[PDB]
Amino acid sequence: VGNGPTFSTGGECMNTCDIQNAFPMNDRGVRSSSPFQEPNTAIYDSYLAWTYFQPMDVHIEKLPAPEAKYYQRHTKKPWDVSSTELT
């Protein structure tokens, strides 16, 4: 698996944060570091506890590609700049 980063956490433990409910909980009882579902989320205990997620090779049943009509929204405006372009 790659060395790429993931959704940022800010060095916070999601099992005790004020918005913990927004983070899904897996079978082991460890809330995810991101809105996505994570099976191998863990918690490390330094002076402060922090959540971590290790990327891994996992296969997920991929729903077939829909049509562009049902997910594309051509409401773009001259002032609008996408996050990728901004980055």
Using the minimum distance from each CB to another protein, give the nearer residue, 48 or 83.
83
Find out whether 47 and 19 touch, Cβ atoms under 8 Å.
no
Please tell me whether residue 15 binds another protein under the rule CB under 8 A: no
Q: From CA 22, how far away is CA 15, in angstroms rounded?
A: 10
Please tell me whether residue 50 binds another protein under the rule CB under 8 A: no
Beta strands in 7-48 (DSSP E): 41-45
- Shortest distance in whole angstroms from residue 19 CB to another protein: 5
Q: Give residues in contact with another protein (CB under 8 A).
A: 1-8, 10, 19, 21-23, 34-38, 40, 42, 52-58, 60-68, 70-80, 82-84, 86-87
